[PDB]
């Protein structure tokens, strides 16, 4: 509803409730992750080769085809599985 | 603004443990193309003229 003959001074810069919305969206972003899956067994040595592609030596492939040992649902047996990652998500640790 | 990844990907499930699934990339079905965006040239020049004004 509209208020007649009234004048209030505002300030968006010293305003509150942008602090509240920032804190609440950060915490609410965090609270949708507690049921989710931690990638503890995936921190592992990745044997990465280039993606199957016509490689140009001047440019770079932005995808690496990485194979690795993955633990299976049984705690005895492990498997070998491959995946595709980006350059920005993997780094080379110091031939092979 | 329009924005796209034109690469057709294959989500592949990997069993980590009991009730633990990792969704990895499988195949790249087709061409390996670069993700990009488009804006209109004319309306962006128009809005830059407005903001300079």
């Amino acid at each position: 509803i509209h208020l007649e003959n009234v004048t209030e001074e505002f300030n968006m810069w010293k305003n509150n409730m942008v602090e509240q919305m920032h804190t609440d969206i950060i915490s609410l972003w965090d609270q949708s992750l507690k049921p989710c899956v931690k990638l503890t067994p995936l921190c592992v040595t990745l044997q990465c080769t280039n993606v199957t592609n016509n490689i140009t030596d001047d440019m770079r492939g932005e995808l690496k085809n990485c194979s690795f040992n993955m633990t299976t649902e049984l705690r005895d047996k492990k498997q070998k599985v491959y995946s595709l990652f980006y350059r920005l998500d993997v780094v080379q640790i110091n031939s092979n | 603004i329009n924005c796209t990844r034109p690469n057709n990907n294959t989500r592949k499930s990997i069993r980590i443990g009991p009730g633990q699934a990792f969704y990895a990339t499988g195949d790249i079905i087709g061409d390996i193309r670069q993700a990009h965006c488009n804006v209109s040239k004319a309306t962006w020049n128009e809005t830059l003229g407005k903001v300079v004004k």
């Epitope: 016509n54 | 193309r33 670069q34």
Partner: antibody
């Protein structure tokens, strides 16, 4: 009317630089691209390479070091030179005029296109028959 | 490799690896004792001099094999066909595809 006309030795001795020249028919050597294509008996052909003036000197990654394709613009001929004739080199060889094109599948500014090459005419032949 | 139909019938000639990216297949034919002749230079184009019904495959299709659909064959078309694909993902193939012959009854 365009055809071709090869010329070579016929009887080939090993451990020797080999030579071939390709005469023209109407179309001059300066204008169009050129190519050499070899084929054994009862086999699929093996494209030796395409050559042209001004840096267009892309060859086969099978050899990369023992072949030299060029032209003879003083005579309006095409020239191929080879090094190290072996038993696999016993094949009939062809000159050709090739042409190109573009196959575009994405943004042209992102270099998302490649060039094909097609040989519409073909040669007549010269048999490299290795004998020692 | 042979395709044996009556002269005047339909025929297909597959050649090579399954597609990975945007191909540009190029088809040739070999007369015996002569240098070859081009028949197809784009995915489904044809130049002047060779007639129609060398219906190639659409090379913008992913996970397919380059065919060569020839309806109403004849003895004058008898040669050794050759695929020569230009896959966008795989590198440049310098040798041609294998000799896919044709005999006619």
């Amino acid at each position: 009317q365009v055809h071709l006309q090869e010329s070579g030795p016929g009887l080939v001795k090993p451990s020797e630089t080999l030579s071939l020249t390709c005469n023209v028919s109407g179309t001059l050597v300066r204008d169009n691209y050129w190519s050499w294509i070899r084929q054994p008996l009862g086999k699929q052909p093996e494209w030796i390479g395409y050559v042209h003036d001004s840096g267009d000197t892309n060859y086969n990654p099978s050899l990369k070091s023992r072949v030299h394709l060029s032209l003879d613009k003083s005579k309006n001929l095409v020239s191929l030179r080879l090094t190290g004739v072996t038993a696999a080199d016993s094949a009939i060889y062809y000159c050709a005029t090739t042409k190109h094109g573009r196959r575009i599948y994405g943004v042209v500014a992102f270099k998302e296109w490649f060039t094909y090459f097609y040989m519409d005419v073909w040669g007549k032949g010269t048999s490299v028959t290795v004998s020692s | 490799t042979f395709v044996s139909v009556a002269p005047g019938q339909t025929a297909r000639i597959t050649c090579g690896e399954e597609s990975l990216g945007s191909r540009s297949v190029i088809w040739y034919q070999q007369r015996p004792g002569q240098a070859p002749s081009l028949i197809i230079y784009n995915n489904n184009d044809r130049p002047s001099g060779i007639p129609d019904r060398f219906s190639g495959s659409p090379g913008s299709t992913f996970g397919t094999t380059a065919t060569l659909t020839i309806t109403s064959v004849e003895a004058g078309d008898e040669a050794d066909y050759y695929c020569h694909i230009w896959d966008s993902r795989r590198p440049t193939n310098w040798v041609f595809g294998e000799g896919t012959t044709l005999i006619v009854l």
